């Protein structure tokens, strides 16, 4: 499946005690490049997802403070299965990867540059992954919600970048991104 080089933000999210893994089926996915720290930011979507009986994976710039504390407590006390991971990479590269993840999961990228805020997120904006496995250092998503036209559009976009790039690093990352999308 599709791998992300980031693991769980807290080990308290673990569902598999023996393997120290988070293991979800049919998981809803929040995709954002915003930091989630204030409890007010996370409460609305948490309330909505709790009603749905679905697991939730949160991908954000970071999750910390009271917002993280609220997530761990709701998981530990059996309200819902939820896990947070950091968005991969940095800067424009992080943005590009989140766009990829949004496409693959059919999520709306709650992007800071477009003025989208986590506080007004609704379930409609969440993506879905068939299988989610979160380890301490990596995450693997299996998804079937992607529009194949969107995938082909994205690959065409990345194709031009790959043909044009002259660095080994970007050559490696772009060619592997096209693989993750394919």
Burial of residue 130, with CB atoms counted within 10 A of its CB: 0-12 exposed, 13-18 middle, 19 or more buried: middle
Q: How far apart are CA 58 and CA 48, in angstroms?
A: 14
Are the C-beta atoms of residues 37 and 10 closer than 8 Å to each other? no
Resolution reading in Å: 1.8
Q: What is the DSSP letter of 13?
A: G
- Residue 76 belongs to what domain range? 1-182
From which experimental method does this structure derive? X-ray
Interacting residues of 81 by C-beta distance below 8 A, sequence separation 6+:
15, 24, 27, 55, 56, 75
For 90-124, letters b (16+ CB in 10 Å) and e give eeeeebbbbbbbbbbbbbbbbbeeeebebeebeee
Strands, E, within 5-77: which ranges?
22-32, 35-36, 56-60, 62-63
8 Å CB contact between 60 and 70: no
At how many degrees (to 10) do helices 168-181 and 91-105 cross? Answer: 10
User: CATH number, domain at 56?
Assistant: 3.50.7.10
Helix (H, G, I), strand (E, B) or coil at 137: coil
Q: Say how many domains are in the chain.
A: 1
Q: Calculate the CA dihedral of residues 97, 103, 105, 108 and round it to 10 degrees.
A: 90
Contact 136, 145 (CB under 8 A): no
């Amino acid at each position: 499946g599709m791998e992300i080089d980031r693991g769980y933000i807290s080990p308290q999210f673990v569902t598999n005690q023996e393997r120290l893994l988070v293991e979800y089926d049919n998981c809803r996915v929040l995709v954002t490049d915003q930091k989630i720290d204030a409890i007010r930011d996370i409460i609305p979507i948490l309330e909505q997802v709790t009603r749905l009986n679905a697991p939730l994976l949160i991908i954000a710039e970071d999750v910390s403070g009271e917002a993280l504390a609220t997530l761990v407590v709701n998981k530990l006390r059996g309200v819902l299965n939820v896990c947070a991971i950091k968005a991969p990479g940095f800067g424009e590269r992080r943005k590009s990867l989140l766009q990829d993840i949004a496409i693959v999961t059919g999520a709306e990228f709650i992007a800071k540059d477009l003025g989208m805020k986590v506080e007004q997120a609704v379930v409609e904006q969440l993506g879905v992954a068939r299988k989610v496995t979160v380890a301490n250092n990596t995450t693997t998503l299996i998804a079937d919600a992607a529009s194949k036209d969107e995938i082909e559009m994205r690959i065409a976009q990345l194709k031009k970048e790959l043909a044009e790039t002259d660095s080994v690093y970007d050559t490696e990352k772009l060619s592997e991104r096209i693989a993750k999308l394919s």
